[PDB]
């Protein structure tokens, strides 16, 4: 199993692509990066419009050449991480499946299945139904459900790449001395981080992006999105972390900080969600808030 | 041969870019 | 077998002719060493070896053709480019397959991704028209030039006489008009396009192509000459006809600039005086709106339609010259080839007819004989048209002075009317210019710049540009704070339209404000529309309805709306 976003649906070149950790290894978010992908492709010898086709329809020498072309090339590119060893799981004639593609179907059904506190109650309300909507899915009887669910993963994918090159682009990671601050003011659609977990999976591509891009400075990161209806930022609080390849465990401190602000602080803030590094505020109280937090010691 | 090594470092600089 | 020759070895050619000692295998081995030699080792000043940048960047696409300068191949190793031009059909077999040796030396199983490699030769330093072709050319190299006249489709053809296959086409390729003697037709070639070039190019376009120039047998030919006649043919081997930072960072610096509307229509047709309002329309219709839609029943086209009525020898048919040398595609009197471009009329049923069922639609749909098909028009209208006879009658509306239906008055976003009227002092100014303009024409590089940086404040290739990146690049939005009060602004226009008995102003005509405002915001780069575009919008607008009325309802429009045409 490979560390490529779900390989045994779409395509091979969608995998290496919309990989997480090949962006941070080779750059994809600009023309520089992407010719060194069709690059890899030529050397390999997989002629790039097959590498573009369905992969359960691929040619059947290539799938099973592919085993030993890996072993020949990732090395020239720094990308020897991409190989490891996973769980895979088949019933009957219908194929197979690995552990690492079945929970991003789980979690894209979380993420998007179907007067200030009533839309808060709506929205609150909405989400707990995909609890049902992913709990149906882990029955064998209804493989259709989660059929469903693959093909939400990847729009998810399209769309948080979609915003995370803005984001590079335009440079608009403000670097700090303490931290690094995010803030999205606008996007094409910024709906769909209203919800936490995916908002989590565009901080996790920045940091990926982050921890590669310089040796230097391993720094926490604060990442914010606002929202037109209720005039709140939902901010949250992330760690750095070490390459894969690379010895305590560091810890997420951003806790204490929120704690203690919103005890000191008069804006007008929430704090009720189990993982205490996400909380809400008002927009006019953003400023203050992080004014009095960066002049803390606490982080 | 030193000639030609202009080629090779051509090829190589996709190993170090 | 075993020995090879030395380059020097190569100076004497010792067999009866250049192909019979070509074809020798010792001969062809060091021919081959030699090449290869060259391929892994030629260099720019700056070391910086260009062809193992370019084989690079073969496999970087996929690719099938590798291109080579025949000038580096004449700056070393001289005698290779004498043997090339004399006896291509040999040479080109032999760098072919040392071609594939040099690119595997980049990306080994290259042969999975293609199985063979042909190599396009560029800069053959010398040209023919298709006059002075003869017989000595015959398996010669060629370099020639043309228009395409006719086109093939593309068919597939057997490669080999288990099956293989390639793609083939043939052009016929004719001189270009400039090129022809006074007084004599011009003359014809056809050429035939293999496996990468076909439908490199398409009818109409201005071609150069280098290729064998071959010859073949023909019973009809000798039939019908009576003399043993033989047939000729063009091979081809290659065929031939964006911006940076620092364009972006100058565009937007103009654009930061003061005025930069003003200086745009000022450079618009530089070798016309006056007409400032025609030049205003036509810098429009060049730059457009947005086109818009909303599957609840409406759509809004980008394209801004104009048309002008002349008294005879008013400078119409030169600003459309201009237009048609200025605008990035168009079509001059076929709306197929006006797809997303500017398409110009200089003078005027079933024409019009298809103009009607044009301007109701975007696309257009057509049946014949049970067939069904659909084309797209996509494109905006430059008109102009001569006012029933010799001369326009200002005391009666517009409809008068047409031979138009109303619709079509109703459609075009921006009417006007142009008029050689009488001063002394216009008279003189007009003079001076066009006889200043015609000395500076005279046929008898600082001359050069003068003369251009005193005919226009902009220089044009800039503008071009400009225009380009502004189409490209740019998609402007209104704001939503003003729109009440042009709501209240185009209320009153109505109320002021039914008081005096005129033709009502209606909805096409507010349409037509918003599609000019969003042009004028992109004409200076800006994603957003502002007060003084729709001012400007609204003036031009006005304007135009105003002008199409009778004399009567003229001056008690303009008396009312002062306030529009001059004030805001
Ligand atoms: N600034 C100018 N103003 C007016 N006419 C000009 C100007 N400069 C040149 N001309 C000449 O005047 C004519 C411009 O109008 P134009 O419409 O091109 O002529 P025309 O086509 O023969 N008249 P028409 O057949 O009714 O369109 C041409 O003959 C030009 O050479
Ligand atoms: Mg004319």
Redesign the interface.
Known sequence: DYYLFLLRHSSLYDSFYYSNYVNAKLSLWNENGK?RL??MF??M?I???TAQETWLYMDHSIKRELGIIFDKNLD?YGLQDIIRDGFVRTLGYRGSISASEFVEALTALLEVGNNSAQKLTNLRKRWVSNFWLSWDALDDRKVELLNRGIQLAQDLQRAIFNTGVAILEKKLIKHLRIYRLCVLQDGPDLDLYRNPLTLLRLGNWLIECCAESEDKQLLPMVLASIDENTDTYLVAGLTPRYPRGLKKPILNNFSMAFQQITAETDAKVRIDNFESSIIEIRREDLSPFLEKLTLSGLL | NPKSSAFFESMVEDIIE | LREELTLESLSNVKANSYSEWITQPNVSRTIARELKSFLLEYTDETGRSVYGARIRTLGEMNSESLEVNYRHLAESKAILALFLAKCPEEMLKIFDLVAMEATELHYPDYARIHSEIHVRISDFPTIYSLRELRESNLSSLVRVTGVVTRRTGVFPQLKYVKTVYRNYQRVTLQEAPGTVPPGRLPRHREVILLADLVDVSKPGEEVEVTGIYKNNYDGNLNAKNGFPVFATIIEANSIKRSWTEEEEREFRKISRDRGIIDKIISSMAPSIYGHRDIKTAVACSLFGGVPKNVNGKHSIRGDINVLLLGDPGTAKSQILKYVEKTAHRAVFAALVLADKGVCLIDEFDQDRTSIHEAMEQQSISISKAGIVTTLQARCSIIAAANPNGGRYNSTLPLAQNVSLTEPILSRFDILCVVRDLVDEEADERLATFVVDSHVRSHPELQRQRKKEEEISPIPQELLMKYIHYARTKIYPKLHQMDMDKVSRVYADLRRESISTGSFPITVRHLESILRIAESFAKMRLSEFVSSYDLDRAIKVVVDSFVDAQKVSVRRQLRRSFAIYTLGH
């Open positions: 010719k069709h690059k030529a050397r010898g002629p790039l419009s020239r």
